[PDB]
Ligand binder design. Structure first.
Ligand code: MG
Ligand code: MG
Ligand code: MG
Ligand code: MG
Ligand code: MG
Ligand code: MG
Ligand code: MG
Ligand code: MG
Ligand code: MG
Ligand code: MG
Ligand code: MG
Ligand code: MG
Ligand code: MG
Ligand code: MG
Ligand code: MG
Ligand code: MG
Ligand code: MG
Ligand code: MG
Ligand code: MG
Ligand code: MG
Ligand code: MG
Ligand code: MG
Ligand code: MG
Ligand code: MG
Ligand code: MG
Ligand code: MG
Ligand code: MG
Ligand code: MG
Ligand code: MG
Ligand code: MG
Ligand code: MG
Ligand code: MG
Ligand code: MG
Ligand code: MG
Ligand code: MG
Ligand code: MG
Ligand code: MG
Ligand code: MG
Ligand code: MG
Ligand code: MG
Ligand code: MG
Ligand code: MG
Ligand code: MG
Ligand code: MG
Ligand code: MG
Ligand code: MG
Ligand code: MG
Ligand code: MG
Ligand code: MG
Ligand code: MG
Ligand code: MG
Ligand code: MG
Ligand code: MG
Ligand code: MG
Ligand code: MG
Ligand code: MG
Ligand code: MG
Ligand code: MG
Ligand code: MG
Ligand code: MG
Ligand code: MG
Ligand code: MG
Ligand code: MG
Ligand code: MG
Ligand code: MG
Ligand code: MG
Ligand code: MG
Ligand code: MG
Ligand code: MG
Ligand code: MG
Ligand code: ZN
Lengths: 10, 37, 204, 174, 140
RNA sequence: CGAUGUCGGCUCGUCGCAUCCUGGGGCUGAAGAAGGUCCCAAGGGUUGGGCUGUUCGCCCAUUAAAGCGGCACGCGAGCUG
RNA sequence: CGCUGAAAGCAUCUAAGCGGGAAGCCCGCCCCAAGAUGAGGCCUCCCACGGCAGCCGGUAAGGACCCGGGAAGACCA
């Protein structure tokens, strides 16, 4: 299920 | 065999039997044969 | 439950009824029985067999005694066959007739420290499309916090081969008693020169 | 209304010896051991065996009848014997005796051979009638069931192995 | 005055015929004997109970439907590695384990409790090899 | 919130059973063959492809079958991105 | 799914007892395996050596070291 990134990429 | 929580006599020839810790219904009519479950 | 010790000599094929039969040739005879294990004495039943003659110069004293008690000239290898009790004081290839089916046990060839693709036929990683230094790696080895560990027995890299292997139900193609040769159809564990055990088969 | 209390007529000359928890029943046709509850008293009378129960507790009442009938059947077994007849029905279907054994031809790709266990005797008067006989009522009835099971009565056709006196109830097909 | 502490004592050997006794209620008595709690000089931090020999373990008894229903359990550490063996079968294959397993659970855990369990010697069948110890037959 | 990296894929499994297949069975408006329906059963098995990032789904060609779920929507100090 | 069978004069696979019955379960096959400290067993070999369940010394059967190698192997084994 697509849900949004809660963290950004490192 | 019908398997259900409610076992009942269906016709007047139905016989309620308890067998190895389970309730069955045995009958000359095979359709009526039931075990509780 | 007949059995015999022997060395793998090598493979070829013979022709039998216009058919090529791939075979491994085993030098089997002759194996002096050097101890019998008995239910009274030992608790079970079997025959310790000896095989290939040894230079007495190389046989220490405890060994010599064991051989002596049998009236048996020293031999390089001792191995038991279980639930077998030959009438003779010597076992030879004659205990097998062509047509019989056997099980052969060998020490398999040693691959040493083997990766997961050779040991377990893992698929490894892509070779392109971005795979980064993981072309022959195993991938995941687990879940997350549950269960938080790796199963005992998880297939992983490590030593592989030089192991006891028993291939089963091989046909006896021929037996050449005059040269102590047993010809078995198919393949037998281990290198040429390696020691093997040939038993009556347990399949029906 | 009652089986335990009803006495067991014992004919000349079958014997009934009691022992704690078993009774032995001898007769013209052999012996039979009736394992029987420690709690019931088996009582030997003139030409009569009776069984008595310690109380009118449910288990006791239950053991009571079973015990009489068990003994009564033992008695009859060693005197008159016991038997069941099976009729075979349907075109291919036949029986015949191969030595002491019973061979059944009932439409399989092979015939079915039944061996008599100790105490059982197979008899084939006509070829579509089989008789199973012995002094042990359960064993007889059992072997009969075994034989019958080789080829149950079809649901659609008078065909298969039937007990004598067993009614043919078929259903239509189309 | 300080509570008395026994100097080392020579341990008593005891024999118990298990035939027909009820598994659990025989077990607790065995446990007591092993701890040493029948002794007025009982001391909790040393092994001073009896050595216990039990024979006819295969003829232990059990109430209810346990032969069919009591399941002994072993975990191998491998996936799928829980073996369930039922009383019947255990009796049928390694009967001495049934008494053994019961008493073991009624001993303390730890180094000492482990040691006490070693002092229990259980045999299926009427005989035992501990004659050299002249074990004192004990009715329990 | 002085950081518990987040969808899909790959890799690697392991478990549940409310079983997709295979084994056993009762009833059937079960002649037969084939089905339906329920029961027991988790040992094993459960394909390749077109589309789309897709999970899903649709589709082609097969199959005994092309099961559904849990494992931080299993698995980024294992890869991808 | 049964046999035999009461309670419950009939009936009942069940309450006593006995039978049949799954790719499943236990055994069977293959591999590991006595650190199985519950440390198993068998065969063979050495031997009751000097000085003061202990220490020091020289040996026994045997072992290791070193070397030439090996379809064994990362070193080790
Ligand atoms: Mg209703
Ligand atoms: Mg009504
Ligand atoms: Mg009826
Ligand atoms: Mg070998
Ligand atoms: Mg190698
Ligand atoms: Mg690899
Ligand atoms: Mg491989
Ligand atoms: Mg490959
Ligand atoms: Mg690949
Ligand atoms: Mg590749
Ligand atoms: Mg790729
Ligand atoms: Mg990159
Ligand atoms: Mg690369
Ligand atoms: Mg993660
Ligand atoms: Mg954990
Ligand atoms: Mg190795
Ligand atoms: Mg030839
Ligand atoms: Mg080679
Ligand atoms: Mg009389
Ligand atoms: Mg009286
Ligand atoms: Mg139709
Ligand atoms: Mg006491
Ligand atoms: Mg044992
Ligand atoms: Mg505590
Ligand atoms: Mg946070
Ligand atoms: Mg922190
Ligand atoms: Mg941080
Ligand atoms: Mg973390
Ligand atoms: Mg993301
Ligand atoms: Mg899964
Ligand atoms: Mg289910
Ligand atoms: Mg099916
Ligand atoms: Mg059909
Ligand atoms: Mg039709
Ligand atoms: Mg069906
Ligand atoms: Mg059903
Ligand atoms: Mg399964
Ligand atoms: Mg599984
Ligand atoms: Mg599955
Ligand atoms: Mg294209
Ligand atoms: Mg695609
Ligand atoms: Mg898609
Ligand atoms: Mg879609
Ligand atoms: Mg199909
Ligand atoms: Mg697909
Ligand atoms: Mg979720
Ligand atoms: Mg996830
Ligand atoms: Mg998933
Ligand atoms: Mg992830
Ligand atoms: Mg990453
Ligand atoms: Mg991901
Ligand atoms: Mg991670
Ligand atoms: Mg990380
Ligand atoms: Mg991490
Ligand atoms: Mg990786
Ligand atoms: Mg009937
Ligand atoms: Mg009846
Ligand atoms: Mg009535
Ligand atoms: Mg019963
Ligand atoms: Mg049964
Ligand atoms: Mg039957
Ligand atoms: Mg059976
Ligand atoms: Mg199979
Ligand atoms: Mg071994
Ligand atoms: Mg050892
Ligand atoms: Mg060993
Ligand atoms: Mg242990
Ligand atoms: Mg040892
Ligand atoms: Mg070297
Ligand atoms: Mg080297
Ligand atoms: Zn009815």
């Amino acid at each position: 299920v697509d849900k949004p990134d809660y963290r950004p990429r490192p | 065999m019908k398997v259900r929580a409610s076992v009942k006599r269906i016709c007047d020839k139905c016989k309620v039997i308890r067998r190895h810790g389970r309730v069955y219904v045995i009958c000359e009519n095979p359709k009526h044969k039931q075990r509780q479950g | 439950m007949k059995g015999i010790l022997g060395v793998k000599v090598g493979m070829t094929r013979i022709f039998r009824d216009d058919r090529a039969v791939p075979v491994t040739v085993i030098l089997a005879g002759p194996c002096p029985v050097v101890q019998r294990r008995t239910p009274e004495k030992d608790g079970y039943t079997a025959v310790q067999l000896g095989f290939l003659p040894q230079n007495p110069k190389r046989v220490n004293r405890p060994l010599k005694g064991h051989f002596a008690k049998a009236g048996v000239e020293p031999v390089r290898i001792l191995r038991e066959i279980r639930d077998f009790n030959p009438e003779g004081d010597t076992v030879t290839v004659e205990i097998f007739k062509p047509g019989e089916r056997v099980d052969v046990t060998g020490t398999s060839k040693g691959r040493g420290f083997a990766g997961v693709m050779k040991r377990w036929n893992f698929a490894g990683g892509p070779d392109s499309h971005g795979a980064h230094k993981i072309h022959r790696h195993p991938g995941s080895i687990g879940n997350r916090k549950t269960p938080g560990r790796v199963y005992k027995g998880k297939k992983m890299a490590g030593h592989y081969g030089a192991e006891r292997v028993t291939v089963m139900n091989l046909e006896v193609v021929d037996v050449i008693p005059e040269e102590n040769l047993l010809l078995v159809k198919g393949a037998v564990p281990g290198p040429n020169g390696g020691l093997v055990i040939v038993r009556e088969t347990k399949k029906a | 209304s009652r089986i335990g209390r009803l006495p067991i007529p014992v004919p000349k000359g079958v014997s009934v010896e009691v022992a704690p928890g078993r009774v032995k029943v001898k007769g013209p046709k052999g012996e039979l051991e009736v394992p029987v509850s420690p709690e019931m008293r088996v009582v030997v009378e003139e030409g009569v065996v009776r069984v008595e129960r310690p109380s009118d507790e449910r288990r006791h009442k239950s053991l009571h009848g079973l015990t009489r009938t068990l003994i009564a059947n033992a008695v009859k077994g060693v005197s008159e014997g016991y038997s069941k007849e099976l009729l075979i029905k349907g075109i291919g279907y036949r029986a015949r005796l191969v030595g002491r054994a019973l061979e059944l031809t009932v439409g399989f790709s092979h015939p079915v051979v039944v061996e008599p266990p100790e105490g059982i005797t197979f008899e084939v008067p006509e070829p579509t009638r089989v008789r199973v006989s012995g002094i042990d009522k359960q064993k007889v009835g059992q072997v009969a069931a075994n034989i019958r099971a080789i080829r149950k009565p079809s649901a659609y056709h008078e065909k298969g192995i039937y007990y004598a006196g067993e009614p043919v109830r078929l259903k239509p097909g189309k | 005055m300080k509570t008395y502490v026994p100097k080392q004592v020579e341990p008593r050997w005891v024999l118990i015929d298990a035939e027909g006794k009820t598994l659990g209620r025989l077990a607790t008595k065995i446990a007591t004997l092993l701890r040493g709690k029948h002794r007025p000089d009982w001391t909790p931090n040393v092994a001073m109970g009896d050595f216990v020999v039990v024979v006819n373990a295969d003829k232990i008894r059990v109430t209810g439907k346990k032969l069919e229903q009591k399941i002994y359990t072993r975990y191998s550490g491998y996936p799928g590695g829980l073996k369930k063996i039922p009383l019947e079968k255990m009796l049928a294959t390694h009967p001495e384990r049934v008494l053994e397993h019961a008493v073991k659970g009624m001993l303390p855990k730890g180094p000492l409790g482990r040691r006490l369990f070693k002092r229990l010697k259980v045999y299926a069948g009427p005989d035992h090899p501990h004659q050299a110890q002249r074990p004192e037959k004990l009715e329990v």
